[PDB]
Amino acid sequence: MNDVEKLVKLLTSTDSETQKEAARDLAEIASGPASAIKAIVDAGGVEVLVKLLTSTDSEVQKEAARALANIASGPDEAIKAIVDAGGVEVLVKLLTSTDSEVQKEAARALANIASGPDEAIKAIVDAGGVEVLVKLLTSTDSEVQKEAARALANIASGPDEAIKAIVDAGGVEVLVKLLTSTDSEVQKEAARALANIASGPTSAIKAIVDAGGVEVLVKLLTSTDSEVQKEAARALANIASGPDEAIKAIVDAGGVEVLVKLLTSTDSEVQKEAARALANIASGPDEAIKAIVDAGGVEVLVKLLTSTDSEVQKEAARALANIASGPDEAIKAIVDAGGVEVLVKLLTSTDSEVQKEAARALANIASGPTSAIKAIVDAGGVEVLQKLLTSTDSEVQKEAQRALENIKSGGWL
Template identity: 35%
Template sequence: MASKGPAENRLKSYKTKGLDVSEVRRRREEEGVQLRRSRREEQYSKRRNLTDVDELEAENATFPEGTPFTEVARALFANETEQQLAALARFRKALSKFGQSPPIQEVIDTGCVPRVVEILTFDNPSLQFEAAWVLTNIASGSSLQTRTVIGCGAVPHLVKLLTSQHEFVLEQAVWALGNIAGDSPECRDVILGSAIMPHLLKLLLVPDLNLTVLRNAAWTLSNLCRGKNPEPPSDVTLTCVPVLARLLYHTDPDVLCHSCWTAAFIADGPDSRIQRIVDGGLVNRLVELMLHHERSVVTPALRAVGNILTGDDVQTQVVINCSVLPSLITILATPHENLRKEACWAISNITAGNRVQIQAVIDCNVFPLLIDIMNSGSVFKTRKEAAWAILNATSGGTRQQIRSSHYLKRALQPKEQTYTTVESRYELLGT
């Protein structure tokens, strides 16, 4: 069977009531590219663990600056633990300098990675920590460098370290796993296939867990749930929904950010996945977080809610019942253009719903704001989203709804007709 193209695969991103299928598919493809670009800007999929300069200058007696990496690598095979620690620390520091391109390939070229992976199995927390840090920063590099870590068998050992009694060890292990998962869907699936999820979810539920560990674990979870072509297996990722329901009430903005992204990734799919988010009781909290004081939380919360609104009318009504429209009105007044655009996109999926849902938008006086954005907005993509929200309402609303809404009638006045073609719809934008 021929594979579906990207437009067809992303068909569900917009509801289709009143629209020609070819229009929706084209719009889905365009929006998909933009959302992916926005996602890259909002959340890094890999992170390097950096070291302070003062620490880099300390403890360099064994392997001072300029010592060949081949000599450092040989020390990993020494019998003395102190030599092994010194060698790992030298590699770790070389890979951790602020503001410098790390010598990842040079370290790999010494052939040390299999030995570093082996050291993960040693019954020595300090060695395990240093080895995991080295692997974390190697995995922060290119896909080929990340696959070197996988190819040397690091993943099952890193997963096992999630049960360590030492927080500093498990923190570094979960960070390394997050970097590997963030490289690509293929690497992500290697991690998911190593039975990480039960260990990670158990870790996320530990009472009074160190905040930096919790942040890293929540970030790793988001990397495990992200990605397309292929998507992560739902039977694995959906097991995190009950844990998300708790994480979304944490007070730390970073934990909230990562948890909202995880919810957004899960909801970016079929209605069955959206239903798990609904059944898990996440919707009301996600709507609340749309008005969080940190933009890093608002962006993924809005994305998650917008993705839920691509579901069926029943799922959309759940979101409306959580008072999403007043929150969207607040976001429409923000100076942040990306948030305004996504708010318009979310509203367009409400107005693509049933007539009761269109009436809810009318009753909240959203259309004056949309028309103002459509006519006066400075960014084309935001204006286009506002136009789609209006056009969905004029296509799916009743004549009485259109007649009773001064603003919907005003939206139709330029052509004095219901818009039926792509060209005439875009004329609403004045371009």
């Protein structure tokens, strides 16, 4: 028997001390390379460790949990071992322990498990783990509270059943309160959680909106930490892709001007998430469009049209097409920002989506005032649009057609 095996054997000793020392050494190993975590699994350490989770020695528990938690950070193979060994159900019980040091390792273990496949997340949910974890979000031990938030955030990045569990357990309200926490880590986790939740079904986005999360998230966009901003912007973008009521919430909370500001962040993710949110918001009702225009959004979005970041460019193009399908005021805005000329150049982009969105925005602008139709004209748009009538992209095609008819019919539709 090798180093590892002798340890696994040394785990079932009648002497508690010998025992705790074996869990400590396996834990240390589990914190190394993946290959080492496999060495334990093979030796059969996972099953043994899980039995010690029910020891009557709160300390023997702690050392075995820490060992599992560290094994749970390895590959899926390891995570399944714990699950198969029936570890999730147990760890879940340890969540309610009196020894806070058992809670921390149990929660950390569970959280590391929730970062695995959707199956592992199903297991935690099926084991009634969510509601318990939701209670730990208010624990008095900063560390237990952090592992819990991280656990829920991971579960929220899984099946809808998972998201619904959190929502149907009062979780959203609790996470939204954690947004205004004091611990950097707790706050970031809660923000990630909600963005993960906001990317689910409408029930989910509505739950976040009804708990007043939007206002809070809008305030988070002003954090001085790009890492926190990403999550907030992302959560807001996911909320904005929701129904019209969700959009109105963002608008009313003043989210639009704040997002317009974040459109020039030097952090690419913040910038992308911001553009996506505005793109989503611009797909809502007229007033939402108004808000972008009144916040100076159009001029900014126009500059982002030449962003060397393909993702950012795509969201700006989409945002501008959507804004362009609004009232003539919205159209005059794009025209005044120099937008037409830029879009005309974008009609021949090699990126299918940038192109399509450009075609769409020029078609929408082509159905506006005489000044708008002329702006296109002057930019040499008729020509560039015609060449497009014979492209493989059915969508680009339809938009070029639509754009040209609108020009010929002097706007009349």
